[PDB]
RNA sequence: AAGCUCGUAUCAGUUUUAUGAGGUAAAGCGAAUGAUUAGAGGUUCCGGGGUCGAAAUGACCUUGACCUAUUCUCAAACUUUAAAUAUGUAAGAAGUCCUUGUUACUUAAUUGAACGUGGACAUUUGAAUGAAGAGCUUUUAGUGGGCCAUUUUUGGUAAGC
RNA sequence: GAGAACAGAAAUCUCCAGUAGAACAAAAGGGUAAAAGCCCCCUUGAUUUUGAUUUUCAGUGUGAAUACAAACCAUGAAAGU
RNA sequence: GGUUGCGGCCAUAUCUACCAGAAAGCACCGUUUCCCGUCCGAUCAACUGUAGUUAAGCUGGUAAGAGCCUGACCGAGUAGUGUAGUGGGUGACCAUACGCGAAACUCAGGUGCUGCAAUCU
């Protein structure tokens, strides 16, 4: 049965990984702000590598999460550059999915040579009604099986609206 | 100019060391590679 | 250079196993404990025969190894290299210390070798064959008797092969639907556990 | 669920359950220790807790003491009773708590004899005050703030049921800075603002902008306000005079209860399944093997 | 070098009791200790403050003081050829009422009863305690139970 | 050694009863941790090999890992369980119960806490056994290399070590 | 474990599992999960007066510790600490 | 009896998979002016109880389920152990006398009990 259970996008989280901090990192942040309008959250390098030219806590990469209708614009604005075809992977058996794109300009977004070109990691989180039951504080609990988001339930749902194609195998 | 925002890492590890999953030995040899 | 076997004969000290407070110990001299046809199916070798230790004593690795070799080599070239399954029921977990050549001052040892603490009535060598073969097994243990300190006597197992069940109780379990082969051993039908995949396995049951 | 995520026999065996009320996420026991524990040299003197619980749109205010057999309710006031004193709308709001906190304050103070003495603040200009000790008299009845799991956020409405209980005659220790109107960048309070929240001056002044700006919403939420013909500027009066009516008659009417004990039970057991017998389970097994044999 | 620190050797003594770790159930803090109560002393490793010394584990005593978190207990510790009085400050996590006295009081109350109950009946009491008394004479019946004769068993191997 | 205060009295290298502590012995390893033999059954877009190959997130053999049910064997510095011997306290007049005083502590509170006035309850004063006794004080000698036996047990091949 | 441009065995992002298999300066062992771990906010009780107490013990000292008393403070809505 | 708030012990309550759940109550759920908190009104906060839903949470039931609990002359008076002998054995060791007495195994039973308050066909 499916009265209340339909599906909804919990959040989209854009991501920019970059091999340093300094200018190149901030520009990529500027990218994600005006792309979300939200002011975004950087991350720190969890350890040192040096084959990547990074040290621990070096502010390696920025991201931002987006919820609501303003995501479904940026999702579909992205699903455009991928030409409405994803893969049979890209879909986590938990039910989410994500995809990358080089060249952030490829969706809206004019050039500005004082910014440059960056790629993104678009990842989309799919949950249902009753998704606070594992989120809230009091009586914290766990979504019953029949209600959990799966890959099957997500793919078919990506197949129908957006019309797009899942491909591969 | 704005206040930067940084993520909070719940992991309790102080040691600047790579995890065990990071090792030279996994490393599939003849991985796809570009050419041309 | 190997201290004569009389110095470590008796269990005179609490077990001194290789450990992180140890670490320094040499390899054991016996290494392989399973010989003959070890893949044999439980039904192939009904007859079991034991070498039992009648003393509470210590058996050195090098002594296990040399009664392994003895009992196997004879049993193989007499009844043939697959005639039997010879499994050594004892493992040398005890490190033996020696005081090298100070005075008696600061005399704590350094690991000299390994051995296995053995009980009265403890089985040492267990062998399975066809009952046809008994006298070859027996003698083959009997000839490993000589390589060990103490009184050890050979015994004819009331049981089926290496199993925990006596011979009649094995048929009744095997000739009803209760027994199912595993590689060298078997698994058994239990009256407890989920009835779903209880019937998945042992489908041969459930008829009567 | 997932075959490779698996609780081994060991896992179950060596798992240590948290308590019960911990598994149900209901009780923070480390807060329950520090509340419930009495100074050992006060012996059997009970510590009394002010229990402010928020459901979805009912407010639960309880004064409770603790016993190794079970906790014990001295007095109990809910927002669902507030219709008696003239509030049928917004029973989940800051003003409905203040109201349910003044109802609990004067309901216990009543059957406790601290009734005539210690009337608390009957004025309500929304100033900061704790009910003082009367010279040469009993001391103000003490009860303490059990937040539950509620987050401490300046303005939150757990402190409403506080300020309704502290202006209502009880001695409940508190500071000022969890109250609406608390100034963040200087230590100060504006009573004016806090006063407003007591009678609903944010909810009216929301109704005020929603008649002349968006009435669509104003027609969806705020429906009963039109259905009852109660517009904005009148909210403060509804609560102002409910305060009066409360101090008047705190005495707690229970409901007329309409189908006794035996009845409610006889109907509830029709829907509640009764387990089984081993011989029957035994017959299920002998039956399933019969079926699943072939 | 040899070692004795305050908690030495206490590894398994202060250990937390399998599947019973974690914070302490509230009935502990609920119980009320009046001066003169008989307490058992058992440490609780989770509570490091107000902790008895390893000697006093297992010990039983009486409470001379009652402060905020803690009952002061006196124990008679033997040292040399005498006993000295020793005074311990323990948090009630580490203490429990002793049920040694339980039967006593119950017998006290029981004794006063049997006294006024027999005395208001014309006495004949005998309320002291007796050790187990040798069995009385008894008949035993062979009806339906004839003696089943038994023999020691012959040696068997079965290994 | 000197005594001293006493004398049905308190008293015990003992038992019974009631109630507490302990983690050794043993036991356990298809319970955790650590070791350890052997098979069997799974899983790789993915450790490495081969064959088919333009290749594949290709198919198939193959060897290693993991996984799942199993199997032989272990621990002073492992463990769920857990002895025996030893171990703490209790078995009353300094006791039990009624009544209701004192305060600067404490309670919302003449509430409670601690010590109390007054009143009631008797003998078989509260299990066994033993007791000539019990409690108390001063002062001072020698000594402050020990050794042996059964059992427990450390080093050591051992030793009349 | 399953997932996402460059991105590989390891970079950053998301979910699901997760009794603690981590972390708490250091040795080991205790102890700990809405915490004792991780992040942030405020602070200076790491203060003042002098007793009692436990360990070692001669029941001296010293070190270390425990519970109070009297002050003056920190923090928190508060119980508290 | 059902439910909710606060609970006592803290698995007979946990775990895995299904299915059933009236009434109320919980729950999900609706909004963003206000206090308040976030990269993100997801969580946290505030308003509405309206617009919608028993889908989940929650309650219960099923199961030769996992685990946990209990019981037994089930194993076993076994292992271990206190006491004794000018007992046996070269010895390792082991019988006996007087007492104490496990663990694993196996069988059978069980699957939270209940306090204070307010509720509810
Ligand atoms: Mg961190
Ligand atoms: Mg993590
Ligand atoms: Mg020689
Ligand atoms: Mg030795
Ligand atoms: Mg020989
Ligand atoms: Mg808290
Ligand atoms: Mg030492
Ligand atoms: Mg213990
Ligand atoms: Mg400290
Ligand atoms: Mg042990
Ligand atoms: Mg020990
Ligand atoms: Mg042992
Ligand atoms: Mg065991
Ligand atoms: Mg193991
Ligand atoms: Mg048990
Ligand atoms: Mg007496
Ligand atoms: Mg008197
Ligand atoms: Mg000498
Ligand atoms: Mg000599
Ligand atoms: Mg000598
Ligand atoms: Mg630990
Ligand atoms: Mg905290
Ligand atoms: Mg301080
Ligand atoms: Mg000292
Ligand atoms: Mg020191
Ligand atoms: Mg309903
Ligand atoms: Mg929302
Ligand atoms: Mg909220
Ligand atoms: Mg349903
Ligand atoms: Mg259920
Ligand atoms: Mg079961
Ligand atoms: Mg002799
Ligand atoms: Mg005996
Ligand atoms: Mg059963
Ligand atoms: Mg159950």
């Amino acid at each position: 049965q499916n009265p209340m259970r339909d599906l909804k996008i919990e959040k989209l989280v854009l991501n920019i990984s970059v091999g340093e901090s300094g200018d190149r990192l901030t520009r990529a942040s500027k990218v994600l702000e005006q792309l979300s309008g939200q002011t975004p959250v950087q991350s720190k390098a969890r350890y040192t590598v040096r084959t990547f030219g990074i040290r621990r806590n070096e502010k390696i990469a920025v991201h931002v999460t987006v919820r609501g209708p303003k995501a479904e614009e940026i999702l579909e604005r992205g699903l455009k550059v991928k030409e409405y075809q994803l893969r049979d992977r890209n879909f986590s058996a938990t039910g989410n999915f994500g995809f990358g794109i080089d060249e952030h300009i490829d969706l809206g977004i004019k050039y500005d040579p004082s910014i440059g070109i960056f790629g993104m990691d678009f990842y989309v989180v799919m949950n249902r009604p009753g998704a606070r039951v594992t989120r809230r504080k009091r009586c914290k609990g766990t979504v019953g099986n029949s209600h959990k988001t799966t890959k099957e339930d997500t793919v078919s749902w990506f197949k129908q609206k957006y019309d797009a194609d899942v491909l591969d195998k | 100019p704005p206040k930067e925002i940084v993520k909070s890492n719940t992991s309790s590890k102080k040691a600047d060391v790579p995890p065990p999953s990071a090792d030279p030995s996994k490393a599939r040899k003849n991985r796809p590679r570009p050419s041309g | 250079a190997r201290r004569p076997a009389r110095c470590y004969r008796y269990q005179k000290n609490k077990p001194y196993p290789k450990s992180r407070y140890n670490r320094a110990v040499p390899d054991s001299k016996i290494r392989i404990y399973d010989l003959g046809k070890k893949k044999a199916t439980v039904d192939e070798f009904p007859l079991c025969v034991h070498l039992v230790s009648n003393e509470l004593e210590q058996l050195s690795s090098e002594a296990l190894e040399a009664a392994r070799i003895c009992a196997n080599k004879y049993m193989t070239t007499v009844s043939g290299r697959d005639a039997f399954h010879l499994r050594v029921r004892v493992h040398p977990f005890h490190v033996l210390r020696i005081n090298k050549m100070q005075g008696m001052r600061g005399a704590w040892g350094k690991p000299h070798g390994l051995a296995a603490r053995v009980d009265i009535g403890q089985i040492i060598f267990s062998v399975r064959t066809k009952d046809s073969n008994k006298d070859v097994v027996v003698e083959g243990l009997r000839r490993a008797r000589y390589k060990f300190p103490g009184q050890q006597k050979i015994i004819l197992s009331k049981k089926w092969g290496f199993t925990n069940l006596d011979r009649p109780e094995y048929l009744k379990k095997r000739e009803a639907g209760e027994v199912k082969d595993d590689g060298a051993f078997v698994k058994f039908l239990s009256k407890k556990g989920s009835l779903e995949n209880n019937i998945r396995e042992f489908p041969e049951y459930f008829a009567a | 669920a997932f075959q490779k995520d698996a609780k081994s026999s060991a896992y179950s065996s060596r798992f240590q359950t948290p308590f019960r009320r911990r598994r149900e996420g209901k009780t923070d026991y480390y807060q329950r220790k520090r509340l419930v524990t009495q100074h050992k040299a006060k012996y059997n003197t009970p510590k009394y807790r002010l229990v402010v619980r928020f459901t979805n749109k009912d407010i639960i205010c309880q004064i409770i003491s603790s016993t190794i057999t079970g906790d014990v309710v001295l007095a109990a006031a809910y927002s669902h009773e507030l219709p008696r004193y003239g509030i049928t709308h917004g029973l989940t709001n800051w003003a409905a708590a203040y109201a349910t906190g003044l109802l609990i304050a004067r309901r216990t103070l009543q059957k406790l004899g601290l009734d005539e003495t210690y009337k608390g603040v009957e004025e309500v200009e929304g100033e900061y005050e704790l009910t003082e000790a009367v010279e040469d008299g009993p001391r103000p009845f003490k009860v303490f703030l059990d937040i539950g799991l509620q987050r401490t956020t300046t303005g939150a409405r757990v402190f409403g049921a506080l300020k309704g209980a502290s202006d209502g005659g009880l001695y409940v220790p508190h500071s000022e800075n969890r109250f609406p109107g608390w100034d963040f960048e200087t230590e100060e309070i504006d009573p004016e603002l806090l006063r407003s929240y007591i009678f609903g001056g944010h909810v009216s002044q929301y109704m005020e902008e929603l008649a002349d700006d968006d009435e669509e919403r104003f027609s969806e939420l705020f429906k009963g306000y039109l259905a009852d013909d109660i517009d904005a500027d009148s909210l403060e009066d509804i609560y102002t005079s409910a305060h009066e009516a409360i101090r008047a008659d705190p005495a707690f009417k229970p409901t007329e209860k309409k189908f006794t004990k035996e009845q409610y039970a006889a109907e509830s057991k029709k829907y509640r399944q009764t387990k089984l017998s081993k011989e029957e389970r035994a017959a299920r097994v002998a039956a399933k093997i019969a079926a699943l044999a072939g | 070098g040899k070692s004795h620190g305050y908690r030495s050797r206490t590894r398994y003594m202060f250990q937390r009791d399998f599947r019973k770790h974690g914070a302490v159930h509230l009935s502990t803090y609920l119980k009320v200790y009046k001066v003169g109560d008989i307490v058992d002393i058992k440490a609780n490793g989770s509570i490091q403050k107000g902790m008895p010394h390893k000697f006093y584990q297992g010990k039983t005593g009486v409470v001379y003081n009652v402060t905020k978190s803690s009952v002061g207990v006196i124990i008679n510790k033997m040292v040399g050829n005498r006993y000295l009085e020793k005074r311990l400050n323990l948090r009630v996590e580490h203490i429990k009422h002793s049920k040694c006295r339980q039967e006593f009081l119950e017998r006290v109350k029981a004794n006063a009863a049997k006294r006024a109950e027999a005395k208001a009946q014309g006495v004949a009491v005998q309320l002291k305690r007796q050790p187990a008394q040798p069995r009385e004479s008894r008949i035993v019946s062979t009806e339906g139970n004839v003696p089943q004769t038994l023999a020691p068993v012959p040696y068997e191997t079965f290994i």
Side-chain angles (χ1 to χ4, degrees), chain A, chain B, chain C residues 1-101 103-208, chain D, chain E:
Chain A
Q1 198 35 256
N2 356 256
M4 165 97 266
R5 61 122 86 194
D6 303 20
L7 221 313
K8 60 134 76 282
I9 315 177
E10 167 172 19
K11 42 186 173 182
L12 151 99
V13 184
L14 318 143
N15 170 104
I16 304 185
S17 320
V18 16
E20 61 233 66
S21 71
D23 280 64
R24 162 141 280 260
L25 188 280
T26 67
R27 307 194 238 105
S29 167
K30 211 162 321 182
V31 171
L32 276 206
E33 167 175 52
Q34 72 169 72
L35 191 271
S36 71
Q38 309 176 0
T39 121
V41 40
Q42 316 169 318
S43 304
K44 264 172 184 165
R46 289 155 43 185
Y47 39 101
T48 299
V49 167
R50 182 224 294 251
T51 98
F52 306 172
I54 72 185
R55 306 180 248 77
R56 189 172 126 89
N57 317 317
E58 204 180 316
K59 275 178 165 66
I60 214 182
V62 305
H63 69 295
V64 62
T65 95
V66 171
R67 314 167 173 266
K70 186 211 278 180
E72 284 175 289
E73 305 164 16
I74 304 185
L75 186 245
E76 201 159 14
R77 176 130 48 125
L79 273 177
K80 192 152 297 196
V81 195
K82 231 66 202 165
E83 286 171 357
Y84 295 65
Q85 287 187 337
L86 288 187
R87 290 175 126 181
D88 179 57
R89 50 278 206 184
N90 314 22
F91 283 86
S92 58
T94 61
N96 295 316
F97 59 91
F99 58 91
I101 128 257
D102 343 39
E103 304 230 300
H104 65 292
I105 28 176
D106 271 335
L107 52 204
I109 279 67
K110 214 180 328 96
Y111 170 46
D112 194 305
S114 41
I115 280 188
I117 319 291
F118 292 91
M120 280 183 205
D121 269 295
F122 283 61
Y123 202 93
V124 170
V125 188
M126 306 299 303
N127 63 346
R128 302 194 128 127
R132 126 182 267 255
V133 140
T134 96
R135 254 65 214 287
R136 63 197 179 193
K137 233 268 170 52
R138 200 163 112 75
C139 324
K140 201 170 307 218
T142 62
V143 171
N145 261 348
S146 67
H147 204 105
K148 276 178 212 158
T149 78
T150 92
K151 192 187 203 150
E152 266 170 49
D153 282 325
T154 292
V155 169
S156 164
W157 176 95
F158 187 43
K159 256 158 173 154
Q160 179 146 270
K161 47 132 58 194
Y162 304 114
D163 200 284
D165 280 315
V166 76
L167 315 180
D168 259 281
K169 283 283 181 296
Chain B
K3 179 164 85 176
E4 319 176 329
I5 319 290
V6 180
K7 179 89 102 52
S8 282
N9 183 29
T10 68
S11 183
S12 41
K13 233 107 185 56
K14 280 43 73 100
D16 188 9
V17 149
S21 74
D23 135 80
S25 288
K26 185 38 65 260
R28 345 135 55 184
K29 229 147 179 179
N30 291 283
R31 120 175 108 99
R33 294 278 71 196
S35 79
Chain C
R2 250 255 312 170
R3 240 172 190 187
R6 52 190 132 97
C7 327
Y8 308 101
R9 182 154 152 181
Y10 295 155
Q11 303 191 178
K12 295 195 69 201
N13 262 148
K14 299 196 222 88
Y16 187 45
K18 181 174 162 224
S19 70
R20 63 184 228 268
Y21 326 104
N22 218 334
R23 316 176 236 81
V25 344
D27 280 320
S28 165
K29 212 87 268 150
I30 194 197
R31 226 69 151 67
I32 112 270
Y33 311 70
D34 275 296
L35 311 87
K37 188 175 188 202
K38 48 209 193 66
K39 280 129 177 310
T41 161
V42 174
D43 300 271
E44 190 161 347
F45 290 134
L47 190 248
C48 195
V49 165
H50 292 313
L51 221 208
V52 186
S53 176
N54 215 22
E55 316 213 317
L56 174 278
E57 77 192 292
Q58 297 187 170
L59 308 185
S60 76
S61 70
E62 25 272 312
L64 290 183
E65 166 79 353
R68 204 261 289 140
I69 301 163
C70 194
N72 161 261
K73 160 127 27 58
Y74 174 81
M75 291 175 79
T76 56
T77 68
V78 168
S79 56
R81 90 153 167 98
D82 279 351
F84 62 100
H85 179 190
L86 199 212
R87 175 191 273 167
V88 180
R89 294 269 238 116
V90 141
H91 287 65
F93 288 122
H94 186 27
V95 188
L96 302 178
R97 283 183 316 282
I98 182 162
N99 205 4
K100 206 47 200 183
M101 163 285 297
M104 187 75 214
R105 114 139 35 103
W108 169 262
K110 300 175 67 180
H112 183 43
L114 281 120
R117 304 175 117 233
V118 149
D119 241 281
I120 280 194
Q122 171 146 10
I123 294 176
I124 321 172
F125 278 4
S126 283
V127 165
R128 51 200 276 250
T129 55
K130 326 271 194 54
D131 311 285
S132 76
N133 202 200
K134 173 240 294 265
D135 310 321
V136 178
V137 178
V138 155
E139 181 82 345
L141 296 189
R142 223 208 52 116
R143 296 149 153 271
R145 231 208 261 264
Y146 293 78
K147 309 286 173 175
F148 280 151
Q151 194 196 31
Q152 46 267 340
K153 40 196 197 200
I154 77 296
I155 289 188
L156 303 184
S157 181
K158 266 61 185 304
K159 302 314 189 65
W160 186 279
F162 283 180
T163 203
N164 278 309
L165 320 162
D166 325 67
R167 307 262 282 237
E169 182 96 339
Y170 183 56
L171 306 181
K172 197 205 279 180
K173 242 121 182 55
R174 172 245 247 177
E175 287 174 7
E178 298 182 77
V179 172
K180 114 181 199 59
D181 244 308
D182 207 78
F185 205 46
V186 280
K187 304 192 172 178
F188 305 88
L189 177 79
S190 163
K191 304 319 180 304
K192 114 277 252 254
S194 162
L195 195 39
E196 157 53 25
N197 38 305
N198 227 36
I199 314 216
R200 280 199 193 201
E201 301 311 352
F202 315 79
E204 250 298 325
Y205 194 67
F206 311 109
Chain D
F2 291 14
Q3 284 118 323
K4 184 56 223 153
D5 319 336
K7 282 89 169 88
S8 46
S9 349
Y11 188 90
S12 337
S13 217
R14 308 180 104 249
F15 194 66
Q16 161 162 16
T17 50
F19 269 145
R20 177 146 73 58
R21 232 106 201 304
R22 235 281 56 160
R23 295 182 272 102
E24 306 162 353
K26 302 186 173 193
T27 282
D28 165 13
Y29 271 106
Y30 193 121
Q31 205 151 309
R32 168 180 186 80
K33 232 127 93 171
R34 268 124 239 257
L35 284 181
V36 157
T37 63
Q38 188 52 279
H39 177 118
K40 243 40 223 300
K42 298 189 246 253
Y43 298 90
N44 282 343
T45 282
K47 251 179 168 171
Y48 279 121
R49 317 155 34 199
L50 171 56
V51 163
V52 180
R53 292 303 184 255
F54 291 88
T55 90
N56 266 309
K57 321 314 163 299
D58 189 27
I59 319 187
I60 297 201
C61 257
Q62 280 170 333
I63 267 74
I64 291 175
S65 46
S66 311
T67 248
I68 99 115
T69 338
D71 275 22
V72 153
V73 194
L74 195 189
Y78 304 99
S79 77
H80 69 64
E81 300 175 33
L82 291 199
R84 183 207 221 177
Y85 304 94
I87 316 154
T88 34
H89 290 341
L91 348 94
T92 164
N93 50 35
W94 215 101
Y98 181 109
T100 321
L102 163 67
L103 168 64
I104 238 312
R106 320 236 59 128
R107 177 164 306 175
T108 98
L109 239 33
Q110 200 187 48
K111 69 144 57 176
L112 241 49
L114 285 302
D115 202 18
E116 187 74 279
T117 149
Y118 283 140
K119 281 179 184 184
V121 207
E122 297 155 315
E123 200 66 18
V124 198
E125 258 193 52
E127 214 92 1
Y128 176 46
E129 48 186 1
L130 350 290
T131 70
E132 282 322 280
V134 145
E135 183 170 320
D136 219 56
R139 256 140 66 233
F141 177 64
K142 198 162 58 190
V143 88
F144 302 102
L145 220 200
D146 168 320
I147 238 184
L149 313 153
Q150 259 258 30
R151 262 246 266 288
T152 283
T153 113
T154 147
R157 61 208 208 275
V158 117
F159 312 125
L162 200 236
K163 232 293 184 186
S166 151
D167 279 16
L170 291 173
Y171 183 79
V172 190
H174 62 66
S175 269
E176 22 178 356
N177 69 280
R178 274 322 138 174
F179 282 136
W182 174 250
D183 190 323
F184 197 140
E185 274 167 353
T186 180
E187 54 135 10
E188 256 181 338
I189 173 97
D190 169 66
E192 281 192 331
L193 212 161
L194 176 49
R195 186 186 152 282
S196 192
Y197 269 77
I198 295 155
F199 311 108
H202 60 334
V203 166
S204 95
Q205 197 221 335
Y206 190 30
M207 306 158 68
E208 287 284 350
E209 306 168 359
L210 250 231
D212 46 26
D213 260 322
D214 185 316
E215 197 160 46
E216 170 195 281
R217 320 247 36 91
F218 193 88
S219 297
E220 298 171 327
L221 11 134
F222 300 138
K223 165 169 299 170
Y225 285 82
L226 288 44
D228 302 8
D229 203 284
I230 333 184
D231 96 288
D233 39 303
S234 76
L235 218 33
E236 168 182 303
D237 267 322
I238 301 168
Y239 292 143
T240 297
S241 67
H243 304 342
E244 257 194 329
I246 281 175
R247 318 185 107 122
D249 198 22
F252 174 75
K253 164 260 176 199
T255 74
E256 275 275 284
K257 207 64 68 163
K258 184 202 313 164
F259 297 123
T260 99
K261 268 286 168 189
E262 255 281 46
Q263 354 241 301
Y264 279 140
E267 178 95 312
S268 305
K269 289 190 198 163
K270 304 174 166 293
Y271 301 96
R272 153 257 230 181
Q273 292 179 261
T274 204
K275 274 179 194 289
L276 218 6
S277 77
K278 255 282 185 71
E279 321 81 40
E280 292 198 63
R281 278 189 253 119
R284 295 198 93 186
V285 176
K288 203 187 209 183
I289 62 178
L292 262 138
Chain E
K2 313 261 281 162
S3 199
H4 326 279
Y6 195 86
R7 274 183 74 163
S8 151
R9 303 202 197 110
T10 53
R11 174 202 240 255
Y12 304 99
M13 205 187 39
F14 289 162
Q15 224 177 216
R16 209 34 184 85
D17 243 75
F18 183 53
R19 301 219 298 266
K20 304 230 186 303
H21 295 221
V24 317
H25 64 0
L26 254 259
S27 83
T28 265
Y29 301 64
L30 269 198
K31 267 137 59 90
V32 170
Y33 299 100
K34 309 218 298 164
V35 191
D37 298 329
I38 285 196
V39 297
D40 297 342
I41 296 156
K42 189 171 143 44
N44 170 324
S46 46
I47 320 285
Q48 287 101 53
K49 277 170 151 55
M51 206 182 173
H53 179 277
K54 87 234 180 188
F55 174 79
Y56 304 95
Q57 177 111 340
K59 253 88 190 180
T60 308
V62 179
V63 33
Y64 76 87
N65 210 22
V66 175
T67 195
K68 185 157 77 58
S69 46
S70 1
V71 306
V73 194
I74 105 277
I75 291 281
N76 290 311
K77 129 119 72 174
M78 128 83 155
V79 5
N81 48 313
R82 88 211 107 168
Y83 289 74
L84 305 181
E85 210 208 34
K86 300 232 98 312
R87 322 265 256 195
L88 268 25
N89 316 335
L90 307 179
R91 305 179 84 108
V92 320
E93 294 112 306
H94 297 296
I95 259 56
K96 68 202 298 173
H97 281 91
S98 187
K99 286 210 298 164
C100 49
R101 225 79 190 280
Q102 150 200 280
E103 94 123 358
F104 180 56
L105 290 337
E106 293 177 5
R107 226 170 12 114
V108 172
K109 245 182 195 57
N111 274 337
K114 295 182 187 170
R115 175 175 298 280
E117 214 283 334
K119 149 135 304 179
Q121 234 280 336
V123 220
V125 263
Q126 204 293 116
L127 42 64
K128 287 194 204 198
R129 275 185 296 159
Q130 233 63 12
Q133 298 297 317
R135 313 207 200 95
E136 274 315 309
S137 65
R138 48 249 241 143
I139 310 189
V140 298
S141 158
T142 214
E143 208 203 277
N145 185 208
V146 158
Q148 227 244 279
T149 311
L150 272 184
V153 319
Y155 178 46
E156 274 200 311
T157 344
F158 46 72
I159 193 73

